[PDB]
Coordinates of C-alpha atoms in Angstrom, one line a residue:
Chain A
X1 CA 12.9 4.7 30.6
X2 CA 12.7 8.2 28.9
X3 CA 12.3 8.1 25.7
X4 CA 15.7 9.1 24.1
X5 CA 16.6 5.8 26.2
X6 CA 14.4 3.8 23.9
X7 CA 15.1 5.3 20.7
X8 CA 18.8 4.8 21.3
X9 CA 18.1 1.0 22.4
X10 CA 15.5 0.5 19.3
X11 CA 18.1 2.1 16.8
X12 CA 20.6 -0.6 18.3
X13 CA 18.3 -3.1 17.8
X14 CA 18.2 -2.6 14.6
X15 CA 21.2 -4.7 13.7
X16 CA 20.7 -7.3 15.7
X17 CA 20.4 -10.9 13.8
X18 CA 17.0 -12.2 14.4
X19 CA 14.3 -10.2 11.7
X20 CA 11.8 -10.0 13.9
X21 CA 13.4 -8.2 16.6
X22 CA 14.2 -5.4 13.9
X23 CA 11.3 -5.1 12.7
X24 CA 10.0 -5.1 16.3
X25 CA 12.4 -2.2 16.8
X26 CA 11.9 -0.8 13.7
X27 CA 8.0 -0.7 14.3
X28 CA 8.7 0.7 18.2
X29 CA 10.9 3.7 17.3
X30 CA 7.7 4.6 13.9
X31 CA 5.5 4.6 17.5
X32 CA 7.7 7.3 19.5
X33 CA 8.2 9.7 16.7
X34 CA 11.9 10.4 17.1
X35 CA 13.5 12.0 14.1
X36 CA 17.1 10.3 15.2
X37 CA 15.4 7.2 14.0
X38 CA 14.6 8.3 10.5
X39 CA 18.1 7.5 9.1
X40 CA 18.5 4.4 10.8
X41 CA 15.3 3.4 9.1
X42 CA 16.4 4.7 5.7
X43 CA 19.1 2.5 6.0
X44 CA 16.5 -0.8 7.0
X45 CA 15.0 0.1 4.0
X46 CA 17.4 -2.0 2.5
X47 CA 17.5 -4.9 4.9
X48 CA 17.6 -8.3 3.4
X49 CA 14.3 -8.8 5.1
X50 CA 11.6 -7.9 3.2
X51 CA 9.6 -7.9 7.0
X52 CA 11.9 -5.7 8.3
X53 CA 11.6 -3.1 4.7
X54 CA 7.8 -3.4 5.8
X55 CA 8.2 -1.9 8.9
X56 CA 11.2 0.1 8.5
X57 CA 8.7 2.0 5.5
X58 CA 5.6 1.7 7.8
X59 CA 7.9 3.1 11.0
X60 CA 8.9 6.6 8.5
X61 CA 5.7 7.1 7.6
X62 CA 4.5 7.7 11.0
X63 CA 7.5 9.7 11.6
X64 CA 6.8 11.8 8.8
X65 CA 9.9 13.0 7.8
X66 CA 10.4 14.3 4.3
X67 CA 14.1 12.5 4.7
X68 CA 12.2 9.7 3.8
X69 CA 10.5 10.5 0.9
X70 CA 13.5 9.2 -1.7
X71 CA 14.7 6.3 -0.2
X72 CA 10.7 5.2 0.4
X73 CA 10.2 5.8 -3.7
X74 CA 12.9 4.0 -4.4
X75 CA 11.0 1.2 -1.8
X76 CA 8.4 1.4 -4.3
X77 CA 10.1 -0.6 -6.8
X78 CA 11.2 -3.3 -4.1
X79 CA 10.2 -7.2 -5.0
X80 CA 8.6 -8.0 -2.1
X81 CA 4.6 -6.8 -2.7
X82 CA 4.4 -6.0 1.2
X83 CA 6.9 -3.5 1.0
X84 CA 6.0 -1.4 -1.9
X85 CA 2.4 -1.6 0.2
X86 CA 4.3 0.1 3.0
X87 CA 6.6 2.7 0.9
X88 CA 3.4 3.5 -0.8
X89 CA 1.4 4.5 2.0
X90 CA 4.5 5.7 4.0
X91 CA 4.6 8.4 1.3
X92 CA 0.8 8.8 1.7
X93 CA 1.4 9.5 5.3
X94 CA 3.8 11.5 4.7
X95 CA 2.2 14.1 2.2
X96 CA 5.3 15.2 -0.2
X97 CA 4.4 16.3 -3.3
X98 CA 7.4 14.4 -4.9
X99 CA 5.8 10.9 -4.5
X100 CA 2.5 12.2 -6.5
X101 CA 3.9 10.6 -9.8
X102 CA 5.4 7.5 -8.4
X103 CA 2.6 6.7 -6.7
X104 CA 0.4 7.3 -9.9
X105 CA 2.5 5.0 -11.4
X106 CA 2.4 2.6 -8.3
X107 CA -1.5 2.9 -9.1
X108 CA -1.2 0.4 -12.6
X109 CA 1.3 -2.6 -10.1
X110 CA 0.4 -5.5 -10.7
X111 CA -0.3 -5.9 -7.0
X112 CA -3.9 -4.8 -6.5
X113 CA -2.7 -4.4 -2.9
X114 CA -0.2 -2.3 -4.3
X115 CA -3.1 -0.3 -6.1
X116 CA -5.1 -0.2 -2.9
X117 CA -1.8 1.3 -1.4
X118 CA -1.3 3.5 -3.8
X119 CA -4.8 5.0 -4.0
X120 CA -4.8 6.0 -0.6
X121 CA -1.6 7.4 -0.5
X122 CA -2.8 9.9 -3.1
X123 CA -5.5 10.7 -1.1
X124 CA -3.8 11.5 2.0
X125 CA -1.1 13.6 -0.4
X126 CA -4.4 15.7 -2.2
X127 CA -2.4 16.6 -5.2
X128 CA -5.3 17.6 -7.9
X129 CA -2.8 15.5 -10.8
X130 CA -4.1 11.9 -9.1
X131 CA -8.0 12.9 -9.7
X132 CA -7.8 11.6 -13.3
X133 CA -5.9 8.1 -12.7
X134 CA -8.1 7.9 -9.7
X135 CA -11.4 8.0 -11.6
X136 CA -10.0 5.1 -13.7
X137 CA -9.4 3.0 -10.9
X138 CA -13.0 3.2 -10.4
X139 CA -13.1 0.9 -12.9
X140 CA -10.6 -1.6 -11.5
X141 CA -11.3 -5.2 -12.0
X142 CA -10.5 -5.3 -8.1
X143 CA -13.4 -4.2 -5.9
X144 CA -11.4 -3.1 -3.3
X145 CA -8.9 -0.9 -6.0
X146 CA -12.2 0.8 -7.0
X147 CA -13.6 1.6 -3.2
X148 CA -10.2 2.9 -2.5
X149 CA -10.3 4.9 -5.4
X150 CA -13.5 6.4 -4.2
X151 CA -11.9 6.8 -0.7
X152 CA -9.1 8.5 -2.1
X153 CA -11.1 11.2 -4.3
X154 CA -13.1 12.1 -1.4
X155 CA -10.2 12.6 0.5
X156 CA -8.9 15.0 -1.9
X157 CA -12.1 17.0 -2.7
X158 CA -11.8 20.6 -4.3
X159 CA -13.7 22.0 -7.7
X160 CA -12.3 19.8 -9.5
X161 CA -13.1 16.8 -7.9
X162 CA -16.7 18.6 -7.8
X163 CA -16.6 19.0 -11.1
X164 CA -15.6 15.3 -12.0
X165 CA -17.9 14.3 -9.5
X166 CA -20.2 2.0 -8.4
X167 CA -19.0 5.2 -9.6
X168 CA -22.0 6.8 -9.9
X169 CA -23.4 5.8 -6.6
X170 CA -19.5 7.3 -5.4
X171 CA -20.6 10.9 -6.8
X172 CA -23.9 10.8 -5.5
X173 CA -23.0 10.1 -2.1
X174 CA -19.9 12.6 -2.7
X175 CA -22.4 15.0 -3.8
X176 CA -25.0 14.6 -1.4
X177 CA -21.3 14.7 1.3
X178 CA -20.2 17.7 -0.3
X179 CA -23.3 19.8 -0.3
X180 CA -24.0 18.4 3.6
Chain V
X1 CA -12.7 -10.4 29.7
X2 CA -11.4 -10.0 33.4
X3 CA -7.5 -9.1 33.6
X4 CA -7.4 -12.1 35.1
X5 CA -9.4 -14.4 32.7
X6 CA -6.8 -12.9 30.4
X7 CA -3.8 -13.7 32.7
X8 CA -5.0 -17.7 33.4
X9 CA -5.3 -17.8 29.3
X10 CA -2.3 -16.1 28.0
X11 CA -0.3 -18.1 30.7
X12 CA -1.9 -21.2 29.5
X13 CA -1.3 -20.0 26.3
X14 CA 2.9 -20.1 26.7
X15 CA 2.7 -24.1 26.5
X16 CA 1.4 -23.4 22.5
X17 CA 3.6 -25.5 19.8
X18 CA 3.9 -22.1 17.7
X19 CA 6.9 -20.1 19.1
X20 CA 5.1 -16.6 17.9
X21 CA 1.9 -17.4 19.9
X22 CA 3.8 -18.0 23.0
X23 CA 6.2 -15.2 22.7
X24 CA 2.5 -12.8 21.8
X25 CA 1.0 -14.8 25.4
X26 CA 4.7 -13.4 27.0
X27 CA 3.9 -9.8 25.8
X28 CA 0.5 -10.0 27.0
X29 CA 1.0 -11.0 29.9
X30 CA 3.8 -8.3 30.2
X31 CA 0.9 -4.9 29.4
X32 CA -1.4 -6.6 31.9
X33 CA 1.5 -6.8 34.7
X34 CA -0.3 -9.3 36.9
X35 CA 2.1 -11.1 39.0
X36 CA 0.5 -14.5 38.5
X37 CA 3.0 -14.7 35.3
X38 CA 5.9 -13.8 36.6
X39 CA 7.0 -18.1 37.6
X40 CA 5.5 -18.9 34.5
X41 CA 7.2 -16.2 32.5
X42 CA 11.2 -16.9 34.2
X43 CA 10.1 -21.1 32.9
X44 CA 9.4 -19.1 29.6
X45 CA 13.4 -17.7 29.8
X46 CA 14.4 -21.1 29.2
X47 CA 12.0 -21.3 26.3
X48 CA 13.6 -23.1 23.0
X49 CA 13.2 -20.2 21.1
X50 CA 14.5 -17.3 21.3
X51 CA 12.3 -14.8 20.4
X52 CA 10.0 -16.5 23.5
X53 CA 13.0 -15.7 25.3
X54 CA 13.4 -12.4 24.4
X55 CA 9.8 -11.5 25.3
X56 CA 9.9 -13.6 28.4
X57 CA 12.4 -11.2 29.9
X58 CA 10.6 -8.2 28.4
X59 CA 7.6 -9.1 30.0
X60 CA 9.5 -9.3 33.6
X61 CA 10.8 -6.1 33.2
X62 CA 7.3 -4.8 32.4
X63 CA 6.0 -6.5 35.6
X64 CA 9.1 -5.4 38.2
X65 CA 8.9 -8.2 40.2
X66 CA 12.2 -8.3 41.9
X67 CA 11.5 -12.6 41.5
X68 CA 13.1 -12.2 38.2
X69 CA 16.5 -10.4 39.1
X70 CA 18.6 -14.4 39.5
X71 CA 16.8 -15.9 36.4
X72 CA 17.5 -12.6 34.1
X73 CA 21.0 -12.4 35.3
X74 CA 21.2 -16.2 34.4
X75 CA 19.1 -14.6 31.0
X76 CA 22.8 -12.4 30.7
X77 CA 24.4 -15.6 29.1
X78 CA 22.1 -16.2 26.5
X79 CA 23.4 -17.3 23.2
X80 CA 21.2 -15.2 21.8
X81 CA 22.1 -11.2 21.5
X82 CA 18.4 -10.4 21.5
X83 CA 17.9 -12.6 24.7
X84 CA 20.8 -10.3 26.5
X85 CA 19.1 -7.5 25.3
X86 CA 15.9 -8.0 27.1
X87 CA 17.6 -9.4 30.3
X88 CA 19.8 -6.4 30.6
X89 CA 16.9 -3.5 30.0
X90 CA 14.2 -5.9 32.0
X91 CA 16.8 -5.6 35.1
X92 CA 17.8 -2.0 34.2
X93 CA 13.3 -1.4 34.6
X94 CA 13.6 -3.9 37.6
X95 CA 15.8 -1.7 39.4
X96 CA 17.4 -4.5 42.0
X97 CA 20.6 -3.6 42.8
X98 CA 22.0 -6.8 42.6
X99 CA 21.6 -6.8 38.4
X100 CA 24.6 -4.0 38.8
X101 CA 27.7 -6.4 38.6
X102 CA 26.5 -8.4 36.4
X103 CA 25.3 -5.7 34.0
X104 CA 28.7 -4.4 34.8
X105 CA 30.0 -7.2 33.2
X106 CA 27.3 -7.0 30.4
X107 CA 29.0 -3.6 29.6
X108 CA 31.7 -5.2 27.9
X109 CA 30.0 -8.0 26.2
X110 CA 31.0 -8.5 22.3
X111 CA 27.6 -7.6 20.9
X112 CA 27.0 -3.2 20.6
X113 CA 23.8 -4.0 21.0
X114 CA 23.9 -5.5 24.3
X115 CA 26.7 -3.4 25.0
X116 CA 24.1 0.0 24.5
X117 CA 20.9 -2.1 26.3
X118 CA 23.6 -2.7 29.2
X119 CA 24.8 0.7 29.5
X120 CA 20.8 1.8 29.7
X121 CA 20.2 -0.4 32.3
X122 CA 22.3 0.8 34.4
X123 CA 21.2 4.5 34.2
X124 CA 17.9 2.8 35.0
X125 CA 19.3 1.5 38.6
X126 CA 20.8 4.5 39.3
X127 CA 23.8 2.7 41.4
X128 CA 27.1 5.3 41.6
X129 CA 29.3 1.7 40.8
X130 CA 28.4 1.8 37.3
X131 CA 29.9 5.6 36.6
X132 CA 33.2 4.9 36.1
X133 CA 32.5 1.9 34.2
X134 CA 29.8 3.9 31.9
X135 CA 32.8 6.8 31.7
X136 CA 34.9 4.5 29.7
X137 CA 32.3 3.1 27.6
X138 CA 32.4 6.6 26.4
X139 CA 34.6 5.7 24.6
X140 CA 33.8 2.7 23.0
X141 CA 34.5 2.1 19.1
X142 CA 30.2 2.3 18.2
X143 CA 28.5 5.2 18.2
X144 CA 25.4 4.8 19.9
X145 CA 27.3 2.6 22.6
X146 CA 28.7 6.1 23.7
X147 CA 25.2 8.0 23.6
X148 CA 23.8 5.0 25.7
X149 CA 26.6 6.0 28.4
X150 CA 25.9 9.7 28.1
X151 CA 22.3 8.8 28.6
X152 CA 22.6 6.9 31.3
X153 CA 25.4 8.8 33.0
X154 CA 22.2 11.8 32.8
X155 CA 20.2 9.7 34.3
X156 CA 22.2 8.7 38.0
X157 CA 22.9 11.8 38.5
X158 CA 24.4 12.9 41.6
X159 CA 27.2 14.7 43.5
X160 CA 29.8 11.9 42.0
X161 CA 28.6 12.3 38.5
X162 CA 28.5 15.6 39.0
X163 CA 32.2 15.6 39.8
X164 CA 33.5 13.4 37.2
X165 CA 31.1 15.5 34.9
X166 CA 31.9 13.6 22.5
X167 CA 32.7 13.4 26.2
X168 CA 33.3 17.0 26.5
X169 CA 29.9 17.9 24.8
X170 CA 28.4 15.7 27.3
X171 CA 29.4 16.9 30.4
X172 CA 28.9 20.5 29.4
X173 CA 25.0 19.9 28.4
X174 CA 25.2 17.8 31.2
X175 CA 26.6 20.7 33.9
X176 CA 24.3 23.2 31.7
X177 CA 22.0 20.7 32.1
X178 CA 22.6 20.4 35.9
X179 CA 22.8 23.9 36.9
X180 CA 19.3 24.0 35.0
Chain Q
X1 CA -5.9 8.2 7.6
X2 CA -9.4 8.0 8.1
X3 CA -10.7 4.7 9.7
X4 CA -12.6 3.3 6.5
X5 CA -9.2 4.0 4.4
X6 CA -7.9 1.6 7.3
X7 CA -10.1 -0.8 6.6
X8 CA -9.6 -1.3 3.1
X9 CA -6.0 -1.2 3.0
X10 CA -6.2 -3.7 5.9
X11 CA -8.8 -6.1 4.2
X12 CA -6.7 -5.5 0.9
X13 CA -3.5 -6.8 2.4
X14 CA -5.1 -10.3 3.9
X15 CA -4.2 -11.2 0.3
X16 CA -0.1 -10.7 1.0
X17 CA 2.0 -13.3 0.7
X18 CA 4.0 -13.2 3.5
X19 CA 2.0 -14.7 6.2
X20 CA 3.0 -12.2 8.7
X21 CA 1.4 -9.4 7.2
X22 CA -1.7 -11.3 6.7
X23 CA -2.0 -11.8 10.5
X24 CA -1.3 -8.4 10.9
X25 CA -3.4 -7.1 8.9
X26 CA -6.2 -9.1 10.5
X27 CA -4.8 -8.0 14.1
X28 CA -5.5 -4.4 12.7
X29 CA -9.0 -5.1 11.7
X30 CA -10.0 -6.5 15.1
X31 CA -8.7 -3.2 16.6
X32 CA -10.4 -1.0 14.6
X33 CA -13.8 -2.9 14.8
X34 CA -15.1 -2.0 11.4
X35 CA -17.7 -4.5 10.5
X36 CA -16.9 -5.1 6.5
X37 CA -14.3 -6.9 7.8
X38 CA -16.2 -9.4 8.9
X39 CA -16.6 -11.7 6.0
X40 CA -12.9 -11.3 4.6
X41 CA -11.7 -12.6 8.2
X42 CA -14.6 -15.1 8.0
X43 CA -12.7 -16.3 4.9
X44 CA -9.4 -15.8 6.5
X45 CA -10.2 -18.8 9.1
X46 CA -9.4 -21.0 5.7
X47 CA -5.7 -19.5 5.8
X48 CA -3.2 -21.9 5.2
X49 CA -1.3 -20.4 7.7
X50 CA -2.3 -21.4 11.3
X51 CA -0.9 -18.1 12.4
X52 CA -3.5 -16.3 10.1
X53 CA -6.5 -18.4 11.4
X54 CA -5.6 -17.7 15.0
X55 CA -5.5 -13.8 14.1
X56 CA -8.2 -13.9 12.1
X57 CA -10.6 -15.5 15.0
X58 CA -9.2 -13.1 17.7
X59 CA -10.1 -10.9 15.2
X60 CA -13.4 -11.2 15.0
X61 CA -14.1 -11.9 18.3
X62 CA -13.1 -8.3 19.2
X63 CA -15.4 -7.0 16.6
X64 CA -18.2 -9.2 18.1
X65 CA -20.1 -9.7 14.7
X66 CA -22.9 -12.7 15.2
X67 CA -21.7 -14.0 11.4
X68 CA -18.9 -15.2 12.8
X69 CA -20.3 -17.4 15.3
X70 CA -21.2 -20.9 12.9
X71 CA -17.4 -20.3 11.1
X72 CA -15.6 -20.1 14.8
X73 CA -17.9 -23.1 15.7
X74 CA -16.1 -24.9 12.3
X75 CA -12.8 -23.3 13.4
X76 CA -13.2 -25.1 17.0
X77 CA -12.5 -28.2 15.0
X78 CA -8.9 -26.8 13.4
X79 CA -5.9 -29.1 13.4
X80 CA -4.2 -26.4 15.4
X81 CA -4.5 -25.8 19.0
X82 CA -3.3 -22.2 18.8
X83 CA -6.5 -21.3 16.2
X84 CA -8.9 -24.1 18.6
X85 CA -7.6 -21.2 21.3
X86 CA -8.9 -18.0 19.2
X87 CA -12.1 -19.4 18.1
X88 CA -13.0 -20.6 21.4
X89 CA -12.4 -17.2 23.2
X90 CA -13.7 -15.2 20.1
X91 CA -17.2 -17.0 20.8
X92 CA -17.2 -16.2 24.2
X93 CA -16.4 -12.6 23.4
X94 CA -19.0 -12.7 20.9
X95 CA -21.3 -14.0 23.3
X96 CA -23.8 -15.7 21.3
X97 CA -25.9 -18.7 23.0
X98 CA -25.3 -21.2 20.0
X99 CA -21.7 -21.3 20.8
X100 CA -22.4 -23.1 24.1
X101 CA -23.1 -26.9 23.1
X102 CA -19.8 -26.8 20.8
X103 CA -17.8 -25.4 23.6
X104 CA -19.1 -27.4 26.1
X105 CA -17.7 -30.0 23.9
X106 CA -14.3 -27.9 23.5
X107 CA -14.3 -28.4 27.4
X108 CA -12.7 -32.3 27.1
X109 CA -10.3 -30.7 24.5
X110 CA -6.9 -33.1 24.6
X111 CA -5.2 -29.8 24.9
X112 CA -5.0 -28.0 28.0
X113 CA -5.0 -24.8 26.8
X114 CA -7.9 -25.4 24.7
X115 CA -9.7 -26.4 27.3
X116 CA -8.5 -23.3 29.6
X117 CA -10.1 -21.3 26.5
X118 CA -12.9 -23.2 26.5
X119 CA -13.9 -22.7 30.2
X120 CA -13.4 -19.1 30.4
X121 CA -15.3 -18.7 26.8
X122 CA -18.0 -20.2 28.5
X123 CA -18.1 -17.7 31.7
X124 CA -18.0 -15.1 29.0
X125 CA -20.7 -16.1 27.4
X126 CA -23.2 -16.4 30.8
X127 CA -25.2 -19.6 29.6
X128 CA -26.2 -21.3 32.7
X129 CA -26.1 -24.9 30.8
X130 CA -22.4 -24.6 31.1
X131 CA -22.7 -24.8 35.1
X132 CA -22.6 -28.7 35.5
X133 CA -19.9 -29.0 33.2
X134 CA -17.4 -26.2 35.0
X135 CA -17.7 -28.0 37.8
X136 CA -16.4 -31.0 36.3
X137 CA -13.5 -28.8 35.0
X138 CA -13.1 -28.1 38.9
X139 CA -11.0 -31.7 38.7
X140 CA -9.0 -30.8 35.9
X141 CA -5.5 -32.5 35.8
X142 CA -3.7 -29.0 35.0
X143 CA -4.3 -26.9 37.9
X144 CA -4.8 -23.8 35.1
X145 CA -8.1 -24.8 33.8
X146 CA -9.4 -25.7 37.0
X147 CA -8.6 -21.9 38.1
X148 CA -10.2 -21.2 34.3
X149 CA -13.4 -22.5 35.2
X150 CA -13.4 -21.3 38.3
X151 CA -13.3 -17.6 37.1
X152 CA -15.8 -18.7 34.7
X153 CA -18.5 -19.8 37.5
X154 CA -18.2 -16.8 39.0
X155 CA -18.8 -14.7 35.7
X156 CA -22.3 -16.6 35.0
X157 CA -23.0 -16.1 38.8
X158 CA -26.9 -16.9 38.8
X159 CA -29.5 -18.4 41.5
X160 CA -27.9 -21.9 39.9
X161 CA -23.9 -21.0 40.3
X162 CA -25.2 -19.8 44.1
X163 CA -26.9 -23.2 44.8
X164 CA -24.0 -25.3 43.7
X165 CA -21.7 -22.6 45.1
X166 CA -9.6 -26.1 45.3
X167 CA -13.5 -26.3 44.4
X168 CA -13.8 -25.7 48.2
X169 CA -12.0 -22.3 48.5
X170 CA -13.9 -21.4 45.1
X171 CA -16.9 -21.4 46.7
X172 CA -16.1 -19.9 50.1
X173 CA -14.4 -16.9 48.1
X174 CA -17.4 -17.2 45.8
X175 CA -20.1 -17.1 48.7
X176 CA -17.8 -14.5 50.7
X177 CA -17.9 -13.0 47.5
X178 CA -21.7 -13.2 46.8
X179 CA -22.3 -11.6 50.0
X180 CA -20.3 -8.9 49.7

C-alpha cells in the first residue's frame, strides 16, 4: 500500500459512522504527513465528536500546515476541554505567528490543562509577546501550569528572556543553561 | 518480553469483557505478525463488536496469511461499513486472488467508503479482471471513490491498462507516467 | 516538542474528562519513559475508568520504575480483569522480586487470561520460587496458559528449571533446547 493509497482510504474514513474509526483515521493520515488531508481535517474539526475534534486538531498539527491555523483558533473556543488541548498545541506545532494572541488568551482557560496546552504552544511558536504572560504563569496555582511556563520560556530564550531571567530556581537553572 | 510471550498474551487477551482491550490485543497482534493469531483473530471477525471486528480483519491483513481470504470475504457482508472496510483492504494486502470477485462485487456496495477501500484492494491484487470494473468506477458520483480507481488502476499496471489508458487527466499522467 | 514538554502536557491531561484521552495520555507516558510520571500514573491506577487503570499499569511497567511495584501488587486485586492483566505483566516487566508471592497467587486467577498474565509475568521476572507453581500451570484447563507457562519456564531457565525439565514436548524442546 503506497501511501497516497492510505491517505485516500483514511480521508474516506473519515465519514464513516463509528467515532473511533475517524478519529483512528483522523490520527493515521496526522502520522503520514499528507497535505490532501489537511482539508478533510479542517472539516473534522467540526465533527460532533469531541474525540474525533481531538484528533482531527492533533492530526494538523503534525501536518503543519498553515491552512490550519484559523479553523484550529477557532477550535480554541470548542466545549470540549480535550479539544481546545489539541487546537492549542496543534497551533504550537505549527508555529504561525497568528495564534500568538489566542493562545495568550487560551493561557487564563479555566482548564489548567488548557493552560498547560497553551504554555507550550507559545513556546514552540517563540513569539517574544508571550514572555510576559508566561512569567505570570509561574505563579499559577497549578504546579504543572507553572513548570510549563518555565518549559515554555526556555524554549523561547533570546535577550529578553535573559533579561527577565519556583521561579527563581527556573532562572537560575536558565541562567546557569544559558551561559553553559 | 519474547514476541511470543506477547503473542500467547494479546491472544489471550481477545476473550477480555472490554471491547477496546480486545480490539488493542487484535492490533497487537496484527504489528507482531505471528501466525499463531491468525485462527484466533478470523473467531475475532465474528466478534460482537464492531470495532473488534474491524481490527480483527486489519490485523489479517497485516499478517497475509492467505487462511483469512474465506472468513474476510464472509467479513464483506458485515453490517457494519467499517467492518467492510477492513475486510476489503486486509484482502486487497492479502493479495489471494480469489478476494477479486467478491471485491468486485464490493465495488458497488452502497457505502463510498467501502466503495474507495474496495477499489484499493483491488490495485493491491493486481488481477487484470478488476480494470474494467475500476474504469467505471471512475465515474462514480464521490470524489475520492474516483481517485481510489485512478490509484489503483496505477497500480496493476500492464499492457491492458496500458491500452484502455478526471479520466482524461488520469490516463495522461498515467501514460506520462508510463513512458517514465 | 522537547520530551519533558511531552511529559507535562501528558501528565497534565490525565486530568481530562473524557476517559479516552486519559488512557492516552498514560499510553504516551509509558512510551516516552520519563520517570515524573511515575507517581501521577501511580495515582491513575485509582481511575474510575477501568480503561485508564489498565493504561496506566502498562504504563508503568514500560517505564520500569520500582515505586510502582506495591500499587500494581494492590492493582492485582482490581475488580477488572483487563487492569488484573496490566498490573500483572507491568510487574514482570518491572521485574522486581517482591512481586513474585502476589503473582504466584494471581496464578489460580478465575480468569484465564489473568492467569496467562500471571505465568508469563512470572518468567519475566526470573524468580526460581515460581518453578513448582508453572508446572502446575502445565495442567491448565485453557490450553493458552499452559503454553504461558511454558514460555515462562524456559525464560527463568536455571539448574532448577533443567532438573525438573504437552509438559512432555516442553521439556524435550526445552532439553533439545538447553543443549543447543
Amino acid at each position: 500500500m503506497t501511501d497516497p493509497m492510505k491517505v485516500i482510504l483514511y480521508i474516506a474514513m473519515l465519514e464513516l459512522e463509528k467515532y473511533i474509526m475517524r478519529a483512528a483515521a483522523a490520527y493515521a493520515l496526522g502520522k503520514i504527513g499528507d497535505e490532501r488531508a489537511v482539508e478533510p481535517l479542517i472539516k473534522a474539526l467540526k465533527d460532533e465528536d469531541a474525540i474525533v475534534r481531538a484528533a482531527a486538531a492533533d492530526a494538523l498539527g503534525q501536518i503543519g500546515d498553515e491552512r490550519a491555523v484559523e479553523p484550529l483558533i477557532k477550535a480554541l473556543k470548542d466545549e470540549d476541554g480535550a479539544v481546545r488541548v489539541s487546537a492549542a498545541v496543534a497551533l504550537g506545532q505549527i508555529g504561525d505567528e497568528r495564534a500568538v494572541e489566542p493562545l495568550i488568551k487560551a493561557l487564563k482557560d479555566e482548564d489548567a490543562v488548557v493552560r498547560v496546552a497553551a504554555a507550550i504552544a507559545l513556546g514552540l511558536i517563540g513569539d517574544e509577546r508571550a514572555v510576559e504572560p508566561l512569567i505570570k504563569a509561574l505563579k499559577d496555582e497549578k504546579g504543572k501550569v507553572r513548570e510549563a511556563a518555565a518549559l515554555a520560556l526556555g524554549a523561547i530564550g533570546g535577550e529578553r528572556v535573559r533579561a527577565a531571567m519556583f521561579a527563581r530556581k527556573v532562572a537560575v537553572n536558565y541562567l546557569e543553561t544559558h551561559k553553559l
